[PDB]
Amino acid sequence: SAVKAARYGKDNVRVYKVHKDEKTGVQTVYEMTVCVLLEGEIETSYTKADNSVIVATDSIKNTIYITAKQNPVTPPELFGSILGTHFIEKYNHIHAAHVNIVCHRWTRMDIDGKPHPHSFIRDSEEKRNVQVDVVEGKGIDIKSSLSGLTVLKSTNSQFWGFLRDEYTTLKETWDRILSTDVDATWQWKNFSGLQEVRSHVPKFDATWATAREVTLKTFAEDNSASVQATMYKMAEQILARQQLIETVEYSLPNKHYFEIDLSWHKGLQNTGKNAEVFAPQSDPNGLIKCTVGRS
Amino acid sequence: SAVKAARYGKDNVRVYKVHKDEKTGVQTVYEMTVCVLLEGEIETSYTKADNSVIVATDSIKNTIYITAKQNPVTPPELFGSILGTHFIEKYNHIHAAHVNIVCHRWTRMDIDGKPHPHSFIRDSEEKRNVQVDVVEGKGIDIKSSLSGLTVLKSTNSQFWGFLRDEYTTLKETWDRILSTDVDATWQWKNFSGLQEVRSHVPKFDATWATAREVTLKTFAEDNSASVQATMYKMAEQILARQQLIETVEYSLPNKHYFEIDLSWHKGLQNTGKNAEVFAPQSDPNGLIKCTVGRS
Amino acid sequence: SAVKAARYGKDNVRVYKVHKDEKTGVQTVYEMTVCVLLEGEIETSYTKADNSVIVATDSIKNTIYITAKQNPVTPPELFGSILGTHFIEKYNHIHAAHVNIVCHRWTRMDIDGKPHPHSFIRDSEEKRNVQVDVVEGKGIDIKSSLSGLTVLKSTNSQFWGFLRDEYTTLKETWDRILSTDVDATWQWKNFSGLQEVRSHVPKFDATWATAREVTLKTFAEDNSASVQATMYKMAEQILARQQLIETVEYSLPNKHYFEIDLSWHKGLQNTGKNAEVFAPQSDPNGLIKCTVGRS
Amino acid sequence: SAVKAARYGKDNVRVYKVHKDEKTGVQTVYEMTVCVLLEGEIETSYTKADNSVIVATDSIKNTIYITAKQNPVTPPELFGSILGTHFIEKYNHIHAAHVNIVCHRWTRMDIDGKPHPHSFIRDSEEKRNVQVDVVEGKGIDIKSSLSGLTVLKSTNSQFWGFLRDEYTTLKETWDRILSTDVDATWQWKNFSGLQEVRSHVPKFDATWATAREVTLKTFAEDNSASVQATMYKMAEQILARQQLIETVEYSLPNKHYFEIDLSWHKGLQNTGKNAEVFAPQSDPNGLIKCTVGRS
Ligand SMILES: O=c1[nH]c(=O)c2nn[nH]c2[nH]1
Ligand SMILES: O=c1[nH]c(=O)c2nn[nH]c2[nH]1
Ligand SMILES: O=c1[nH]c(=O)c2nn[nH]c2[nH]1
Ligand SMILES: O=c1[nH]c(=O)c2nn[nH]c2[nH]1
Ligand code: NA
Ligand code: NA
Ligand code: NA
Ligand code: NA
């Protein structure tokens, strides 16, 4: 037998950083969960009990805190690139670093219509994420994403004209509820190294904001023919607005809300045009994926 | 042996209701999870396998949907009171109904600075809850609550002057992070029945809004001497603003963020006045409770 | 306003303890999650920012580890009583301690039909729990429980003869699946203090084992007329086997498995006597409770 | 823009099946959660709102139940292969099916030392899983796995001799706790189609049992030099015992248990050789992966 692939590191490293403005007294907080996995010439730790090649996972944890102390943690694309680059430059035998960051929301509170200097609220479990792969000699690959954005529209969704055969019981519909949890990922063109990532720093927050805005507006305004059709419209718009993106991937559950026939009870009408009360279904759920790139 | 207490019913009943405005085309959605447990002269179902006294839990589920079809589902205090009253009036041998409702957030989307007619976002896992106990001959007891409101302030929290003995290692501090998940419950004076609950309908949403506003403002503005002291200030304000409330209960975790000493690494300064990077602790957590009533 | 009730302490304190046998080399591990909440003359911490009355929650955490170091941690009824007694005896102004312990399973591995000296497996998320309330002048109240015991029987469960009215759609049945997660709690007679708890130490593990055995055997063997009827049989047996128990409480979800009618597809028969494939329902679920005491 | 990749289907489909033995009266239950995602000539559903190419996800759900009715559901490798093959054969334009199955434990109860005919217990959240990719013209690729196997050993784990630099604070150790949740995956050689999968049916359960046995025995008996070294020993043994496996992948968290220094309290000794009470850490955790193949 032989080691075909190996990676190891530290997962679930929670990090908080505060920035304090001297002049204004305003404080800004950032909270993330970080995972770093390393690859390189480490096979002998597995095959020969040779620990000399192991940068301890505990040391990886220390490095994450030290790096956060000495560098900006925002945008996360930059922080992840700094962190990954550190490992491949510091350790001769480490040749790839894989950095995953999940950013948690701490949104500044409005108290009496004024933004508060040091108080924050977690407005939703929506996350902003990055995956950064730093590979020696091959540059920096960054995938940025938003996840956990949960939306619902109560009308202007349709689903008809699908394949009907002996396995089909679903009725066609011209008016249904559509609800999903949005997972959207945009993959940047490969960057040659840290200097190039630094050169594009303003694009990272702007593109995240664009992706979120396009997702919300398209969902709200499309008279949706299917999840498939609406998601494609979202992806093509993001690609049009940011030339440094190579692909956009969406993964959308279809979280079903079923009509409840109440006609057995005193002829109560609660279906079709008379549907008011529905039963949200926890499972199963449709799952629709697509990756859209350039022609 | 004897049955000392018994209750049974249906839990985790998910309900969605849509309201459609004829004139304006605006739609409004409500989504809840409902539990109904009944008590009464039902001991023989346990002791004698006498099912004749059992209103099937499946029928309780049907009743919840039918009641939501025929009545407003908001405010939840009203819906819960209607639902509980139904059971004690319909069934001679049922003498108490216990209704728990959790309301999930579906907040109308703003698209281009305009509220959208039929699109919604789940902005946070904060819930609004009610517990309604309808007891034959004894009226309607309602406890209203908010839960899952997660906040953090990065300064203006202190904790010093506590008891120090041979079990104590905690350093006194004049500047720390304070973060919590707010659970706040206000208990209404007993209502004589449904007519009285109806008479106070406008107070329910207003008091919820007040409780939320007082909680956020007090948290943000108090130079906190302890969780204990800040929570008491919140409770006394709510009691002052709504005379129909008898008690307010808060239950607050203290979600700790620890300083990280980095001085072992090149004398890096990251404690006290120099603290920038902290380690959020998943566990353990302080837990502080108090119930405040009138003198 | 006035403080009507207050308690505070430390939750989610994870503790592991190992015992090493000198002679045999056998090791035994215990892992628990502990919560301790205190009550007493502490109102001024809430009302006057007087921290002098506060035993810091951090110190409570330290105390839990120190107490586990100096005392047996099994049975948990004993450990909880030692821990609660410590607080009311050490601190003049603390008058009640509330201790909740959850015990996690670490079951010794069998390797080649021989018990291994120091290797363990988590065989299920079933827990053994205790709630110990130590109240100055009023002794020690202990509630012991098992939870998270998930079982299913595929036949020998019935449900017919229930109330039928205009809200009822459920068909009577003489053969259904019954599945539940067992939560069972037995409440001990009040103990005068630690000496009395020590005197009954052997009864704690024995009664837990009895409660578990009676629950499993009764579930497996009863031709169940309802959840209500089967649960009562369990409770009456436990009360008969241990005279120091005052009440037994069961709380059982009814986790539904629905028949799937496939007759629309080529006349496929999958209902009643021909039912083979079922759809487990995540929600809603029946919830049936009862507390059984002595005549 | 262009569709680069697309797949869609139904996730979280819960399925239960019962087998009833005519002669003996013994019943056996199987419960699974199934996901099926399809690929093929479906781009126009995304780009042109052409639903004619969509096999509705609801129909996929129906197909899963029908297939479970008409076929064995065990071993899951076989069921997944039958299910995936159905889609590529039935629908001209569907060219790949991806089937993921999670099998839940229902272990027959022993009552009075005798196996019960129809009563079952969920003994742990350990799962047996399969991923089956059926690709038209390219055969059937099967990855089998176990997950959620949680183990701990209280001694006979070491970790010393690792890289030490200015980022390192970890002390070397010759005696520590090792605890992990095992995720192990074995990838079968490609099968030409369903006939070949059928020909190897007995190997599937046998190899699962072998993988589990090798994992438990190696964990218990290895005087572990690191997670890396112990996991490699497991993988090489599985590859040696089953020639039809091409690779074995392990993914292991290192779930840390920290010593607690109590020496500040009355010189209490709780470190090194005197360590009895430890603090389980919820996060962060080491994460160690490796894929082992043939030379
Ligand atoms: O077994 C281990 N492997 C590692 O890579 C490591 N790093 N810190 N502790 C560790 N333990
Ligand atoms: O065992 C049962 N008890 C009940 O109260 C009930 N109601 N519906 N089905 C039921 N099954
Ligand atoms: O606000 C606090 N209250 C307390 O009771 C406490 N104990 N430790 N830290 C604390 N902080
Ligand atoms: O939007 C949808 N896409 C689909 O593929 C599908 N299948 N059933 N319902 C559906 N809705
Ligand atoms: Na390198
Ligand atoms: Na009544
Ligand atoms: Na006392
Ligand atoms: Na095909």
PDB file of C-alpha atoms in Angstrom, chain A residues 98-200:
ATOM      1  CA  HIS A  98      -6.316  24.891   2.229  1.00  0.00           C
ATOM      2  CA  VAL A  99      -8.075  27.602   4.188  1.00  0.00           C
ATOM      3  CA  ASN A 100     -11.816  27.682   4.832  1.00  0.00           C
ATOM      4  CA  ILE A 101     -13.349  30.680   6.597  1.00  0.00           C
ATOM      5  CA  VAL A 102     -16.940  31.146   7.696  1.00  0.00           C
ATOM      6  CA  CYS A 103     -17.835  34.755   8.624  1.00  0.00           C
ATOM      7  CA  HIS A 104     -20.618  35.251  11.170  1.00  0.00           C
ATOM      8  CA  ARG A 105     -22.831  38.305  11.134  1.00  0.00           C
ATOM      9  CA  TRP A 106     -22.395  41.004  13.771  1.00  0.00           C
ATOM     10  CA  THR A 107     -24.452  43.915  12.461  1.00  0.00           C
ATOM     11  CA  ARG A 108     -24.198  47.284  14.197  1.00  0.00           C
ATOM     12  CA  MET A 109     -27.320  48.110  16.259  1.00  0.00           C
ATOM     13  CA  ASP A 110     -29.467  51.169  15.494  1.00  0.00           C
ATOM     14  CA  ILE A 111     -30.621  52.720  18.745  1.00  0.00           C
ATOM     15  CA  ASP A 112     -33.063  55.632  18.255  1.00  0.00           C
ATOM     16  CA  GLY A 113     -32.164  55.852  14.540  1.00  0.00           C
ATOM     17  CA  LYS A 114     -28.451  56.265  15.301  1.00  0.00           C
ATOM     18  CA  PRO A 115     -25.771  53.564  14.704  1.00  0.00           C
ATOM     19  CA  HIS A 116     -24.335  52.464  18.054  1.00  0.00           C
ATOM     20  CA  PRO A 117     -20.556  52.701  18.510  1.00  0.00           C
ATOM     21  CA  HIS A 118     -20.019  49.270  20.108  1.00  0.00           C
ATOM     22  CA  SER A 119     -23.214  47.169  20.151  1.00  0.00           C
ATOM     23  CA  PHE A 120     -24.107  44.485  17.618  1.00  0.00           C
ATOM     24  CA  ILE A 121     -26.850  42.032  16.732  1.00  0.00           C
ATOM     25  CA  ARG A 122     -26.722  38.699  14.938  1.00  0.00           C
ATOM     26  CA  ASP A 123     -29.284  39.380  12.192  1.00  0.00           C
ATOM     27  CA  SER A 124     -29.646  35.859  10.752  1.00  0.00           C
ATOM     28  CA  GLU A 125     -27.536  32.854  10.347  1.00  0.00           C
ATOM     29  CA  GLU A 126     -26.597  33.840   6.782  1.00  0.00           C
ATOM     30  CA  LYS A 127     -22.824  33.370   6.326  1.00  0.00           C
ATOM     31  CA  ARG A 128     -20.198  34.746   4.036  1.00  0.00           C
ATOM     32  CA  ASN A 129     -17.551  32.111   3.286  1.00  0.00           C
ATOM     33  CA  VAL A 130     -14.277  31.690   1.511  1.00  0.00           C
ATOM     34  CA  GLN A 131     -12.280  28.683   0.405  1.00  0.00           C
ATOM     35  CA  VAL A 132      -8.651  29.557  -0.418  1.00  0.00           C
ATOM     36  CA  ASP A 133      -6.290  26.979  -1.883  1.00  0.00           C
ATOM     37  CA  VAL A 134      -2.671  28.135  -1.914  1.00  0.00           C
ATOM     38  CA  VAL A 135      -0.535  25.708  -3.930  1.00  0.00           C
ATOM     39  CA  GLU A 136       3.228  26.219  -4.254  1.00  0.00           C
ATOM     40  CA  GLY A 137       4.106  27.163  -7.830  1.00  0.00           C
ATOM     41  CA  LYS A 138       0.436  27.273  -8.868  1.00  0.00           C
ATOM     42  CA  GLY A 139      -0.837  30.467  -7.234  1.00  0.00           C
ATOM     43  CA  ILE A 140      -4.005  31.107  -5.233  1.00  0.00           C
ATOM     44  CA  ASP A 141      -7.464  29.777  -6.045  1.00  0.00           C
ATOM     45  CA  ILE A 142     -10.324  31.464  -4.256  1.00  0.00           C
ATOM     46  CA  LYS A 143     -13.982  30.439  -4.064  1.00  0.00           C
ATOM     47  CA  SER A 144     -16.227  32.972  -2.341  1.00  0.00           C
ATOM     48  CA  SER A 145     -19.777  32.157  -1.235  1.00  0.00           C
ATOM     49  CA  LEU A 146     -22.869  33.138   0.647  1.00  0.00           C
ATOM     50  CA  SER A 147     -24.948  30.499   2.391  1.00  0.00           C
ATOM     51  CA  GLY A 148     -27.909  30.274   4.706  1.00  0.00           C
ATOM     52  CA  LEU A 149     -29.921  33.006   2.984  1.00  0.00           C
ATOM     53  CA  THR A 150     -33.489  31.780   3.507  1.00  0.00           C
ATOM     54  CA  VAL A 151     -36.249  33.330   1.386  1.00  0.00           C
ATOM     55  CA  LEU A 152     -39.862  32.689   0.467  1.00  0.00           C
ATOM     56  CA  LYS A 153     -42.260  34.117  -2.099  1.00  0.00           C
ATOM     57  CA  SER A 154     -45.962  33.446  -1.739  1.00  0.00           C
ATOM     58  CA  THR A 155     -46.936  33.685  -5.408  1.00  0.00           C
ATOM     59  CA  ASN A 156     -45.342  34.248  -8.881  1.00  0.00           C
ATOM     60  CA  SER A 157     -43.834  30.769  -9.045  1.00  0.00           C
ATOM     61  CA  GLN A 158     -45.095  28.163 -11.509  1.00  0.00           C
ATOM     62  CA  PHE A 159     -44.227  24.619 -12.453  1.00  0.00           C
ATOM     63  CA  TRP A 160     -45.909  22.993 -15.435  1.00  0.00           C
ATOM     64  CA  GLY A 161     -44.914  21.308 -18.645  1.00  0.00           C
ATOM     65  CA  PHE A 162     -42.669  18.666 -17.046  1.00  0.00           C
ATOM     66  CA  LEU A 163     -42.319  15.025 -18.173  1.00  0.00           C
ATOM     67  CA  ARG A 164     -45.355  12.888 -17.278  1.00  0.00           C
ATOM     68  CA  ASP A 165     -45.171   9.120 -17.193  1.00  0.00           C
ATOM     69  CA  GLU A 166     -46.307   6.167 -15.068  1.00  0.00           C
ATOM     70  CA  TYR A 167     -44.150   7.429 -12.146  1.00  0.00           C
ATOM     71  CA  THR A 168     -45.764  10.864 -12.090  1.00  0.00           C
ATOM     72  CA  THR A 169     -48.430  12.048  -9.651  1.00  0.00           C
ATOM     73  CA  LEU A 170     -47.505  15.773  -9.403  1.00  0.00           C
ATOM     74  CA  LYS A 171     -50.178  18.187 -10.688  1.00  0.00           C
ATOM     75  CA  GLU A 172     -49.101  21.053 -12.903  1.00  0.00           C
ATOM     76  CA  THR A 173     -49.433  24.450 -11.251  1.00  0.00           C
ATOM     77  CA  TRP A 174     -49.503  28.118 -12.241  1.00  0.00           C
ATOM     78  CA  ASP A 175     -49.300  29.497  -8.726  1.00  0.00           C
ATOM     79  CA  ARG A 176     -47.261  28.017  -5.868  1.00  0.00           C
ATOM     80  CA  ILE A 177     -45.072  29.003  -2.938  1.00  0.00           C
ATOM     81  CA  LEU A 178     -41.327  28.966  -3.593  1.00  0.00           C
ATOM     82  CA  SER A 179     -38.935  28.882  -0.650  1.00  0.00           C
ATOM     83  CA  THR A 180     -35.221  28.026  -0.560  1.00  0.00           C
ATOM     84  CA  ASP A 181     -31.975  28.398   1.336  1.00  0.00           C
ATOM     85  CA  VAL A 182     -29.514  30.015  -1.044  1.00  0.00           C
ATOM     86  CA  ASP A 183     -25.987  28.641  -1.388  1.00  0.00           C
ATOM     87  CA  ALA A 184     -24.091  30.604  -4.068  1.00  0.00           C
ATOM     88  CA  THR A 185     -20.386  30.321  -4.887  1.00  0.00           C
ATOM     89  CA  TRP A 186     -18.298  32.396  -7.265  1.00  0.00           C
ATOM     90  CA  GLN A 187     -14.879  31.191  -8.328  1.00  0.00           C
ATOM     91  CA  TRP A 188     -12.225  33.818  -9.075  1.00  0.00           C
ATOM     92  CA  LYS A 189      -9.684  33.515 -11.811  1.00  0.00           C
ATOM     93  CA  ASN A 190      -6.452  32.071 -10.463  1.00  0.00           C
ATOM     94  CA  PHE A 191      -4.205  34.673  -8.817  1.00  0.00           C
ATOM     95  CA  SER A 192      -0.425  34.481  -9.169  1.00  0.00           C
ATOM     96  CA  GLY A 193       0.213  35.181  -5.510  1.00  0.00           C
ATOM     97  CA  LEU A 194      -0.418  37.545  -2.662  1.00  0.00           C
ATOM     98  CA  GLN A 195       0.550  40.723  -4.520  1.00  0.00           C
ATOM     99  CA  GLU A 196      -2.134  40.076  -7.138  1.00  0.00           C
ATOM    100  CA  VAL A 197      -4.754  39.285  -4.462  1.00  0.00           C
ATOM    101  CA  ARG A 198      -3.893  42.581  -2.755  1.00  0.00           C
ATOM    102  CA  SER A 199      -4.313  44.423  -6.049  1.00  0.00           C
ATOM    103  CA  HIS A 200      -7.985  43.317  -6.261  1.00  0.00           C
TER     104      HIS A 200
END
